[PDB]
Amino acid sequence: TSDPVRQYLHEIGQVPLLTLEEEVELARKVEEGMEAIKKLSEITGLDPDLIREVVRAKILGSARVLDPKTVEEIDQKLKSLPKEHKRYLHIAREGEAARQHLIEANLRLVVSIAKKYTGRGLSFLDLIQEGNQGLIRAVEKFEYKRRFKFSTYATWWIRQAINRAIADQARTIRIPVHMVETINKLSRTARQLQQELGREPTYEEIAEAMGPGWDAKRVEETLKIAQEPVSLETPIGDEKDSFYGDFIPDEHLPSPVDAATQSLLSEELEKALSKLSEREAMVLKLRKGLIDGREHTLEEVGAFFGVTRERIRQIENKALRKLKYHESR
Amino acid sequence: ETFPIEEEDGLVLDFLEYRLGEPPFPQDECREKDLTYQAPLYARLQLIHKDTGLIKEDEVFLGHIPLMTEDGSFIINGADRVIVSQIHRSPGVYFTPDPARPGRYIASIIPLPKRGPWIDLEVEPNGVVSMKVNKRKFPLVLLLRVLGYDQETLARELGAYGELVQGLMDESVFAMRPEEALIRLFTLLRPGDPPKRDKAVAYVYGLIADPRRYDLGEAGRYKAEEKLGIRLSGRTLARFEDGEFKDEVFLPTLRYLFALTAGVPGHEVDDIDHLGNRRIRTVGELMTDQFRVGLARLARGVRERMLMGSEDSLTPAKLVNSRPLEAAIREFFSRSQLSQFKDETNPLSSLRHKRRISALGPGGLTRERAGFDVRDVHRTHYGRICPVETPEGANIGLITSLAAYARVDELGFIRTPYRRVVGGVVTDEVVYMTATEEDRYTIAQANTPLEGNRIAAERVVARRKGEPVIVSPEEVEFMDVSPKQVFSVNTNLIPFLEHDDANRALMGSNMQTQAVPLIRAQAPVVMTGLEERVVRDSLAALYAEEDGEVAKVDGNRIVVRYEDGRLVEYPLRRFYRSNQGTALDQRPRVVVGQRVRKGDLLADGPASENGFLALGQNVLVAIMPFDGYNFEDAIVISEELLKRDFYTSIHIERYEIEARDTKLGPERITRDIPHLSEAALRDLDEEGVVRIGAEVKPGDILVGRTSFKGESDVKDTSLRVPPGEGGIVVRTVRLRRGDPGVELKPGVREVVRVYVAQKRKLQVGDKLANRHGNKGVVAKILPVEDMPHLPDGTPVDVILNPLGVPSRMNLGQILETHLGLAGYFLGQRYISPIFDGAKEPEIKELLAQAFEVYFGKRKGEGFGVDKREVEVLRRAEKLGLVTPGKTPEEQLKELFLQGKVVLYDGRTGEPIEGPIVVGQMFIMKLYHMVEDKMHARSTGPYSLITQQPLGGKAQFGGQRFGEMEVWALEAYGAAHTLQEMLTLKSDDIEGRNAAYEAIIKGEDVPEPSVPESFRVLVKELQALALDVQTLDEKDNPVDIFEGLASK
DNA sequence: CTTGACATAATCCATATGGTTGGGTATAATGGGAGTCGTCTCGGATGCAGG
DNA sequence: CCTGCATCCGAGAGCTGAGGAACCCAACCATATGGATTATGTCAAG
Ligand SMILES: Nc1nc2c(ncn2[C@@H]2O[C@H](COP(=O)(O)OP(=O)(O)OP(=O)(O)OC[C@H]3O[C@@H](n4cnc5c(N)ncnc54)[C@H](O)[C@@H]3O)[C@@H](O)[C@H]2O)c(=O)[nH]1
Ligand SMILES: Nc1ccn([C@@H]2O[C@H](COP(=O)(O)CP(=O)(O)OP(=O)(O)O)[C@@H](O)[C@H]2O)c(=O)n1
Ligand SMILES: [Mg+2]
Ligand SMILES: [Mg+2]
Ligand SMILES: [Mg+2]
C-alpha cells in the first residue's frame, strides 16, 4: 500500500522487455509515423504541431483529458482525404502507438541509471521522473538507421536530464548551472589536493590548482555563495523546547523607543513650523515632504502658488532664518 | 571487516595496514585557534586485477581522527569535550515469561545495535512455534527446513520434551527441498518482490548469515555460548557454506526453550536488569562503531567508482573518497548526545564527568518512556554502580556513576574485586568478578572482625545472590575489599556518611561538583582519606617525575634538575578560563634548592591545598536560630569572612567580535568611531581594542567597529560590555586571514576576543553548601560585633538553623561539627573513613583533651567562671543536660563533651539561655551566583514571526507568562491586568508603541488591540484552506487586518 | 520680487559586455535500500468469532 | 442476521530556567556604461 517506490517498481515490471526485432520495429514505426505526420502537414497546409496533437489526442482516447471541439473539427477535416493519403494517417497513428510502447518498455533503464544519483538533494522518485523526461527526449530523437541499440542513445539523454534537474532543483536558493559546475569543480579539486597534501588545502593552493583566472579572493567568494541556509526549526539543546528561530530578533519593525522618538520629532517639527507664518510653513512642508511624503522642487511649489521658483527659495531661506531664531529662542 | 572490497563479476581492493601520524598542532594551539586536536590516518592498500595479477600498492590519506588527551578528554573545535559511556542491554539469547499467558516463555535473540534485527521465538497457543523478525510472524519450521533439518533429526533432538515437538511438525513444509523452502520463506518475508533464486539467497544470507550485516558481538557470542552450552564458530546465527545454510544458534535456542517450558531442572528465565545482562559501551567502542559506519559508506563509494571507472587505468588513490569517513567522525564528535561539553568547574567535576554512565543516547532509552524498572537500584549494582549518586529530576536512575573500585572488562561488563577466603582465613588474593560470577558464592562483609587474618567471629554477615544471611566462617568463600567499593568517588568524600539519609547524601555528592575554586581554599578539617588521590588523578597539580633537586622557581615556571643530570622545565598554567568561566591556575609550592623525591608535589592546582582536594573553607559555626535571618534554609555569615578574603573567587569572561565582508563594503576594526566624545575612547588602543589592565563597566566599548550604513557613511557597530558585567581586561587575542592554522568562515576578515576578569567576594544571595546536603543562600552579613561569641571573645563565622536537621536526617554534619570543635581547640585535622572511622567515644576523648586546653588556658590567666556562665549552668541543670551536685567547671566540661558551649549575644552581652552547639565546619561556595542571574527588561528585541519578546538573559529577554500564570490571574478576577499582559506587553504592536509613548508623556496607557499572534493564527488557518471569519453581533464580517489584505 | 547666466543631478536611449540558459553527446547498459525491535493505558473502529 | 472480543492505531503524558559526485558549445536577454538631454538649484544682478 505505502512505499510508492515498490508500487512504481511493480508497475514498471508489469511491462515486458523487448527483443531486437521488436525494438527495431517500434523505432521504424515511430520514424515513419513522424514522416507521415509531416506529409499530412504538407497535404493539408496546416501547422504540423497541431495535427500532431490531434492525432495524439485521438489515440490517447477520451480517458486522457486544444479541446474536444477543435480536435473533432480537424479530425473530420482529416476525413476529406481522397485515397492513398489516409494511409499516412494510419501510419501516424501506428507510429504514436509505437512511441508509447517504446517508452513503456524502456522505463526500466531509467531506474537503472537513476539509482546512482541518490543523496544529492533529490529524492529517488524525482530522479526517476526526470529520467523519464530524458527518456522521452531520447525516444523522439532516436535514429534506428545507424543500427545502434536504443539504450546506447537513451543513456546519454537520461543522464543529461537527471544532471540538469539536480542543478536546477537541489538548492533552496537557486544557483545557475554554470556556477553549479564551478562549485563542483572547486570541490573536486580541493578534495584531490587534500589527498595529495595530507591536509585541508588553503585557498591559495586551490586557486593555483584551478588554473588561470583564479585567485584566492575568487575562491573565497565562490565558497561563500555555495553556503546553504539552515533551518529556523533546528533543535537547540536536548529537550524538545528550544529552536534556532527562538534566538533571532526582528530588525525591520520600529521599536517602541524609535516610534516614540519619531512621534516626538514630528510634534517638534509641527511646533517649529506653527511658530513660523502659515504661508511659509506650507511652503516648507511642500518643499520638505511634509504634506504628501514626496519632496517637491521649487518649480512645482511655485506653480501651486503661481509664483517663480526663486521667490519660493528666498521665502524658504527667510523661514530657515526664522527657524534659527526659534531654536535660539 | 569492510575490506576486501570485492567488485562483482574484475578488481579487488584489499586492506594491508594503517598508521597514525603525529598531530599538526599541539593542544594549547588547538585551544587558541579553535582547532580539533587530531592525528592523520593513513591506510596502505593494494588493487589487484583478478586475472592479470597486476598489483598497484599505494598509501592513501583517509583523514583525521581526534586524539584523547592525558586526562581523558578531547579538544573538538577548540572546546574540551567528554564522551559519556552508555549502558545498554547485552547481546545474546534471553528467555522471559510470556506476560499475556502464564506458563509459556518467549525466547529473544539480540545482536549488537544496528547490526541485525531482534528475533523472537514463541510457542503459539495452537502448538506451532513461530519466529517474529521485522514484525513478521512465520513458522520456525520453515527456516529449520532451510537450514537442512530432517524429520528424524528434529524428532531425535527434541523427542524428550513431550508434545512441543509434535506441535513443531508440519508435513506440508517438510515435503519441500531447502531451495523450495528458501523461496517460500523469501515470499513470506518480502511479499510481492519477484522470487529469483539468487535474490532470495542474498536476502536470507544478509538477514542472519552475513558478518557484514549481522553481528552478535564478542559479548553476545560469549553470552550465547555460556547460556546454551554450545560453541560458536563466528558471530552470526547461520553460515553459508558449500552454497547452503548451516545452523548455529536456532536449534540450541529452541531446545533450551522446550526444556524451560517442560520444567526441566537447570533452565531459568533472565533478569534483563541484571548487571550480568547489561554492558557498557565506552568511548572506544562508540567511536569504532561510527568509524565502521563511515568505512561502509566508503566501501559503497569505492564499489561505485569500480563499476564506473576505467578498469585499465585505476589506482587505490582514485578509488577512495574519504569524505564519508571524515563526516561520520565529525558527526560523532560534534553532534552526538554522548559527546558533551566537559564540566570543569573544579577538578572533581571533570573527574566525575569522565566516570558517568548514561542509559540515554542514540539507541538508548527515552526519558519519557523509561518506567521504574530501569531507574531502580538493582541488587547487582553492589560494588559496580553507586546507589547514591544520580540526578534528582526526570533523569533519576538513568544517569549513574561507576563505583570507586569497579572496572569495565574487555567485554563491557563491570567487575568488582573480592578477597579469596579459604578455610576461614582471609587471603591477599583479589579476584575481579562479574555479577554472574558473583552470584555463585557467599561473600562476607568487609567489616568482619579478624585476628591476624583469620575470621574471629562465630556469626558472619554475608550476601548470597544479594540476600543478607548469617553464616559460619567456614561457609564463607569471598570477602569484600572495602566499604569504599560500594559508592562513587564523590560519595566517598562525605565523612560520617553512615549517619546520613540517602537523599541528602545524594544532594551532597552532587553539590561537591558545583564547588568553585577559591583563592584561599582549604582542605577539610575532617576528611575521608581520598582527597589526595582525587587531586593526583585529575592531572591538575604538578609532581616531580623522578628524584631530584629544584633549580628555578617562578610564578610561571619550575625548572627541576633530576639525578639523571637533565634539566626539565614545567610551565605553569596561569589564570586560564575553564568551560564554566572559573579561573584555573597552578601555584608553585617548592623553593629553590629544595630536594624532591619521586612523586613529590611541585605546584598546587585549582581547589588544592598541599596536594589535598580543597573545595571550600573551614569556618566556625553555631547551630541556632537567629532573628529569622536563617529562616527556611537561609544562612547568616560574619563580615570577618569578607575581611580576610574567605570565599573569594576569580572568574573570567570571553567577548568575541568579527569583522567580515559586506556588499556595502567590508567591516573594519578601528578606533575611528563617529559621534562619541574622547571620554568614550579613552581605553581603546591605536587599533581600536581596549588595553590590558583597563577596568570596564556596563556600556563601555571593548572593540571598536564601523559598518557601512547604506540606507540611501559609516555607523557604530562596536562591542560593548553587557549590563551587569565588567571587570579588568586581562587578555586580547586577534586572528587574521592567512595566519598559520587559522580557519575562519568564508567572508570573515578577522576575529577579536577579549578576556575580562572579576574578583567576586561573598555577597547576599550566594549559595553555600556542606558535604551532607545542607545548602542555603546567604541572607544577611552582620558586622563582627553583632555575632555570637565565645567567652574568650572569639566570634563565630556562620549561623545555621537547627530546624534543617530533624526532617532531613543528615546527622553526619553534627558529628563533623563536634570533631571540628575538638580539632579547632587541639589544632589538628582528622581522617575518618566511611563506615570505618571515628565513633562517639573517641570524639568524646578528643573533646576532653580540647576542653582541658580551652579551660586551662583561661584558668592560667587568673579567671574563674563568669556569672553569666553560672546562670546558663542553672538553666542547663533544669534542662537535664548536667548532673546536679557538681562544680561549675565540671558542669562546663559535661556540656563540652556534648559539643556545647556557653555562648554570648554580641548585641546585648547576655548569654544565650541554653548551651549552643559550636564547631568547625567545611562549607563550599557553589557556582550558582546571584550576579549571573539578576535580569530585568522594560523593552527590547522581538521575535520574527510572533512579534513577542525574546527569551533569555543573554538576549535581553522577557519572562514567560505561561498557562498557569494566566490561570492564577483569571482566578483572581484581574481581567485588566491579564489583558495588559496579553496585548500591551507582548505582541500588540500599536498598543505597545502607544503605551510607551503615553507613559513617557505622562498620560495613562490606552486600550489594547488584537494581538499579532491571533492574526498569525488566522493566516495559518487560511493556509490549511479553512475560512476563519470574525463577526460582530449581527453576523457581519469584522476586518481585523485594517484593510491591508482585501483586494 | 523678479531676471538672467552657468553648473550641476536626473532621466533617456544606444549599444557592449558578462552572466545566464538551452542543446548536445550513438558499444551497451533494463526492479532500491536503510532499518528496529526497553510505553501505558485508553478509547473508538473494526474484522472475526460465536450464537 | 445479531452480539461480544480481542486487535490496531492514534494521540496523550507539569512549569519556569539555560541552551547553538560531467563537460562543452553556442545563442540571448539583463544590466552596465556613455553621451546627450531635462529640469533643479545657486550667484549675481537689476
Ligand atoms: N520550577 C522548577 N523549579 C525547580 C526545578 N528544579 C529545581 N527547582 C527550584 O530550584 C531550587 C534549587 O535547585 P537545586 O539547587 O536543586 O538545583 P541545581 O541547579 O543545584 O541542580 P541539581 O539539584 O544538581 O539538579 C537539578 C537538575 O535539573 C535541572 N534543573 C535545575 N534547575 C531547573 C529548573 N529551574 N527547571 C528545570 N530543571 C532544572 C538541572 O539541569 C539538573 O540537571 C529548588 O529548591 C526549587 O525551588 C524544576 O524542575 N522546576
Ligand atoms: N521537577 C521539579 C523539581 C522541583 N520543583 C519545585 O521545587 C521545589 C523543591 O523541591 P526539593 O526536592 O528541592 C524540596 P521541597 O519539596 O520543597 O522540601 P521540604 O519539604 O524539605 O521543604 C518543589 O516543591 C517544587 O515546587 C518542581 O516544581 N519540579
Ligand atoms: Mg539539588
Ligand atoms: Mg519548601
Ligand atoms: Mg528551593
Check residues 330 to 359 of chain B and report those whose beta carbon is under 7 Å from nucleic acid strand C: 359
Which residue(s) pair with A31 in the sheet?
Answer: none
Q: Does domain B91-270 have CATH number 3.90.1110.10?
A: yes
- Closest residue by Cα to atom 23, ligand 1, is B392
- Nearest by Cα to A45 from A67, A71, A74: A74
Q: What is the 3-state secondary structure (H, E, C) of chain A?
A: CCCHHHHHHHHHHCCCCCCHHHHHHHHHHHHHHHHHHHHHHHHHCCCHHHHHHHHHHHHHCCCCCCCHHHHHHHHHHCCCCCCCCHHHHHHHHHHHHHHHHHHHHHHHHHHHHHCCCCCCCCCHHHHHHHHHHHHHHHHHHCCHHHCCCHHHHHHHHHHHHHHHHHHHHCCCCCCCHHHHHHHHHHHHHHHHHHHHHCCCCCHHHHHHHHCCCCCHHHHHHHHHHCCCCCCCCCECCCCCCCEHHHHCECCCCCCHHHHHHHHHHHHHHHHHHHHCCHHHHHHHHHHCCCCCCCCCCHHHHHHHHCCCHHHHHHHHHHHHHHHHHHHHC
Q: How far apart (Å, rounded) are the C-alpha atoms in residues A26 and A47? A: 26
User: What residues of A are in contact with residue B323 (Cβ under 8 Å)?
Assistant: 191
Q: Compute CA B558 distance to the chain's CA centroid, rounded to the nearest angstrom.
A: 34
Count CA atoms within 13 Å of residue B290 on its CB side. 24
**Strands B244-247, B55-66: pairing kind:** unpaired
Q: How far apart (Å, rounded) are the C-alpha atoms in residues B288 and B2? A: 13
The footprint of strand D (CB < 7 Å) covers: A 119-120, 159-160, 163, 177-178, 181, 184-185, 187-188, 236-239, 241-242, 244, 246-247, 297-300, 309-310, 313; B 341, 368-369, 393-394, 935, 951-954, 959-960, 962-964
Ligand 1 centroid – CA B581 distance (Å)? 20
Q: How far apart (Å, rounded) are the C-alpha atoms in residues A182 and B298? A: 25
Cβ neighbours of residue A278 closer than 8 Å, sequence gap 6 or more: none
Cβ contact, residue pair A249, B942, below 8 Å: yes
Q: Among all strands, which nt has the closest C1' to A112 (CA)? A: C30
CB atoms within 10 A of CB B497: 26
- Nearest by Cα to B543 from B496, B497, B618, B597: B597
Cell numbers at A157, concatenated: 539523454
Cβ contact, residue pair A191, B323, below 8 Å: yes
B86 φ, ψ (degrees, to nearest 5): -115, 130
- Please spell the DSSP secondary structure of B768-793, one letter per residue: EE-TTS-EEEEEEEE-GGGS-B-TTS
A with B: how many residue pairs have Cβ under 8 Å apart?
A: 67
Q: Are B380 and B614 in contact (CB under 8 A)?
A: no
Cβ contact, residue pair B942, A247, below 8 Å: no
State the best of A7, A117, A250 to mutate against chain B, taking most chain B CBs within 10 Å.
A250
- Residue B615: strand, helix, or coil: coil
Which residue(s) pair with B121 in the sheet?
Answer: B107, B131
Ligand 1 centroid – CA A174 distance (Å)? 47
Q: Compute CA B336 distance to the chain's CA centroid, rounded to the nearest angstrom.
A: 14
Cell numbers at A198, concatenated: 595530507
Q: How far apart (Å, rounded) are the C-alpha atoms in residues B180 and B1025? A: 55
B210 by Cβ neighbours in 10 Å (0-12 / 13-18 / 19+) ranks as middle
Cβ contact, residue pair B747, A198, below 8 Å: no
List the end-to-end C-alpha distance of chain B, in Å, as a whole number.
67
Q: What single DSSP character describes residue B206?
A: I
| Residue showing cell 532531613 | B808
- Nearest by Cα to A287 from A277, A301, A306, A273: A301
- Nearest by Cα to B939 from A117, A160, A255: A255
- Report how far apart, in Å, the C-alpha atoms of B22 and of each of B25, B64, B515, B644, B1018 are: 9, 10, 37, 49, 61
Count CA atoms within 13 Å of residue B957 on its CB side. 17
B918 φ, ψ (degrees, to nearest 5): -135, 140
CB contact burial B996-1016 (16+ within 10 A = b; e otherwise)? bbeeeeeeeeeebbbbbbeee
Q: How far apart (Å, rounded) are the C-alpha atoms in residues B575 and B566? A: 29
Q: Among all strands, which nt has the closest C1' to A248 (CA)? A: D20
DSSP H or E run through B6: strand B5-6
Q: How far apart (Å, rounded) are the C-alpha atoms in residues B204 and B214? A: 11
| Residue showing cell 598531530 | B23
- Residue B41: strand, helix, or coil: strand
Looking at the CA of residue B928, tell me the nearest atom of ligand 1.
19
Query: Which numeric CATH code is attached to B615-647+762-926?
Result: 2.40.270.10
CB atoms within 10 A of CB B676: 12
Q: How far apart (Å, rounded) are the C-alpha atoms in residues A22 and A29? A: 10
Q: How far apart (Å, rounded) are the C-alpha atoms in residues B899 and B917? A: 6
Is the bond leading into B4 cis (omega within 30 degrees of zero)?
yes
Cell numbers at A248, concatenated: 533571532
Q: Are B958 and B950 in contact (CB under 8 A)?
A: yes
B391 Cβ below 6 A of ligand 1:
yes
User: What residues of B are in contact with residue A195 (Cβ under 8 Å)?
Assistant: 60-61, 317, 322
Count CA atoms within 13 Å of residue B3 on its CB side. 17
- Nearest by Cα to B517 from B651, B344, B649: B649
In B513-567, which ranges are continuous DSSP H helix?
Answer: 531-537
Q: What single DSSP character describes residue B982?
A: I
Which residue(s) pair with B617 in the sheet?
Answer: B923
Looking at the CA of residue B395, tell me the nearest atom of ligand 1.
43
| Residue showing cell 547568616 | B636
Query: Which numeric CATH code is attached to B1-90+271-416+482-540?
Result: 3.90.1100.10
Q: Are B902 and B892 in contact (CB under 8 A)?
A: yes
**Among the CATH numbers 3.30.70.1560, 1.10.3720.10, 3.40.50.1980, 2.40.50.150, which is that of B648-761?**
2.40.50.150
Q: What single DSSP character describes residue B686?
A: T
B108 Cβ below 6 A of ligand 1:
no
Q: Are B45 and B15 in contact (CB under 8 A)?
A: yes
User: For the CA atoms of A279, A281, A282, A287, what is the dihedral angle to 10 degrees?
Assistant: 130
Interface of A with B (CB under 8 A): 6, 10, 13, 116, 191, 194-195, 198-200, 220, 223-224, 227, 238, 245-250, 253-257, 259-260, 263
Per-domain residue ranges of chain B: 1-90+271-416+482-540, 91-270, 417-481, 541-605, 615-647+762-926, 648-761
Calculate the angstrom distance between C1' of D31 and CA of B204.
Answer: 63
**Strands B478-480, B442-444: pairing kind:** parallel
- Residue B948: strand, helix, or coil: coil
Q: Are B435 and B415 in contact (CB under 8 A)?
A: no
Q: How far apart (Å, rounded) are the C-alpha atoms in residues B304 and B324? A: 14
Q: How far apart (Å, rounded) are the C-alpha atoms in residues B235 and B214? A: 8
Amino acid at B308: M
Count CA atoms within 13 Å of residue A311 on its CB side. 10
B392 Cβ below 6 A of ligand 1:
yes
- Report how far apart, in Å, the C-alpha atoms of B995 and of each of A253, B865, B985 are: 17, 71, 9
Task: Give the gap in angstroms from C-alpha B996 to the nearest C-alpha of chain A.
Answer: 6
Angle between helical axes of A177-197 and A216-225 (0-180°, round to 10): 120
Q: Are B332 and B83 in contact (CB under 8 A)?
A: no
Q: Which residue is nearest to nucleotide D12 (CA to C1')?
A: B368
User: What residues of A are in contact with residue B947 (Cβ under 8 Å)?
Assistant: 250, 253
Q: How far apart (Å, rounded) are the C-alpha atoms in residues B782 and B642? A: 11
CB atoms within 10 A of CB B971: 8
Domains B417-481 and B541-605 share a fold: no
Q: How far apart (Å, rounded) are the C-alpha atoms in residues B246 and B181? A: 14
B194 φ, ψ (degrees, to nearest 5): -50, 130
Q: How far apart (Å, rounded) are the C-alpha atoms in residues B611 and B607? A: 9
Q: How far apart (Å, rounded) are the C-alpha atoms in residues B504 and B498? A: 12
Class of domain B417-481: mainly beta
CB atoms within 10 A of CB B167: 17
**Strands B830-831, B526-527: pairing kind:** parallel
Looking at the CA of residue B392, tell me the nearest atom of ligand 1.
25
- Report how far apart, in Å, the C-alpha atoms of A163 and of each of A190, B958, B1037 are: 22, 50, 52
B1032 by Cβ neighbours in 10 Å (0-12 / 13-18 / 19+) ranks as exposed
Provide the edge-to-edge strand list for the sheet that holds B11-20.
B5-6, B11-20, B38-49, B55-66
In B309-346, which ranges are continuous DSSP H helix?
Answer: 316-319, 323-335
Find the radius of gyration of the CA atoms of chain A.
36
Calculate the angstrom distance between C1' of C15 and CA of B850.
Answer: 107
Q: What single DSSP character describes residue B796?
A: P
Amino acid at B701: I
Q: Which residue is nearest to nucleotide C26 (CA to C1')?
A: A153
- Nearest by Cα to B851 from B795, B905, B898, B915: B898
Q: How far apart (Å, rounded) are the C-alpha atoms in residues B181 and B194? A: 16
Angle between helical axes of B812-826 and B840-861 (0-180°, round to 10): 40
> CA-based diameter of chain A, in Å?
106
User: For the CA atoms of B334, B336, B337, B341, what is the dihedral angle to 10 degrees?
Assistant: -20
Cβ contact, residue pair B192, A223, below 8 Å: no
Cβ contact, residue pair A256, B945, below 8 Å: no
Q: How far apart (Å, rounded) are the C-alpha atoms in residues B490 and B516? A: 15
B715 φ, ψ (degrees, to nearest 5): -140, 160
Q: How far apart (Å, rounded) are the C-alpha atoms in residues B108 and B92? A: 8
Q: Are B615 and B607 in contact (CB under 8 A)?
A: yes
B393 Cβ below 6 A of ligand 1:
yes
Task: Give the gap in angstroms from C-alpha B990 to the nearest C-alpha of chain A.
Answer: 9
Cβ contact, residue pair A245, B945, below 8 Å: yes
Query: Which numeric CATH code is attached to B541-605?
Result: 2.40.50.100
- Nearest by Cα to B365 from B81, B134, B119, B89: B89
- Report how far apart, in Å, the C-alpha atoms of A188 and of each of A193, A196, B66 are: 9, 12, 25
Interface of B with A (CB under 8 A): 24, 40, 60-61, 192-194, 304, 317, 321-323, 337, 743, 746-747, 939, 941-945, 947, 950-952, 955, 989, 992-993, 995-997, 1000
User: What residues of B are in contact with residue A224 (Cβ under 8 Å)?
Assistant: 746-747
C-alpha torsion sign, points B615, B619, B622, B624: negative
Check residues 174 to 203 of chain A and report those whose beta carbon is under 7 Å from nucleic acid strand C: 176-179
**Strands B92-97, B278-281: pairing kind:** unpaired
Q: How far apart (Å, rounded) are the C-alpha atoms in residues B677 and B696? A: 17
Cell numbers at B695, concatenated: 577596568
| Residue showing cell 563601555 | B700
Cβ contact, residue pair A257, B939, below 8 Å: yes
- Residue B182: strand, helix, or coil: helix
CB atoms within 10 A of CB B526: 26
Q: What single DSSP character describes residue B751?
A: E
Cell numbers at B869, concatenated: 556562665
Q: What single DSSP character describes residue B636?
A: E
Cβ neighbours of residue B129 closer than 8 Å, sequence gap 6 or more: B121, B122, B123, B139, B140, B141, B164, B167, B168, B254, B257
Find the radius of gyration of the CA atoms of chain B.
37
Check residues 518 to 547 of chain B and report those whose beta carbon is under 7 Å from nucleic acid strand C: none
Cell numbers at B669, concatenated: 576594526
- Nearest by Cα to B917 from B891, B896, B943: B896
Q: Are A316 and A280 in contact (CB under 8 A)?
A: yes
Q: How far apart (Å, rounded) are the C-alpha atoms in residues A75 and A48? A: 14
B632 Cβ below 6 A of ligand 1:
no
Cell numbers at B114, concatenated: 544496528
B993: nearest CB among A224, A247, A256: A256
Q: Are B385 and B375 in contact (CB under 8 A)?
A: no
Cell numbers at B900, concatenated: 556545647
DSSP H or E run through B302: helix B283-308
Cell numbers at B269, concatenated: 528465565
B149 φ, ψ (degrees, to nearest 5): -120, 130
Q: What single DSSP character describes residue B684?
A: B
**Strands B85-89, B356-358: pairing kind:** parallel
In B753-905, which ranges are continuous DSSP H helix?
Answer: 804-808, 812-826, 840-861, 867-879, 888-897
- Nearest by Cα to B628 from B405, B734, B780: B780
Cβ neighbours of residue B144 closer than 8 Å, sequence gap 6 or more: B154, B247, B250, B251
- Closest residue by Cα to atom 38, ligand 1, is B393
Cβ contact, residue pair B950, A6, below 8 Å: no
Q: How far apart (Å, rounded) are the C-alpha atoms in residues B280 and B357? A: 8
Q: Are B760 and B928 in contact (CB under 8 A)?
A: no
Calculate the angstrom distance between C1' of C7 and CA of B717.
Answer: 38
Cβ neighbours of residue B375 closer than 8 Å, sequence gap 6 or more: B396, B397, B398
- Nearest by Cα to B602 from B592, B614, B590, B613: B590
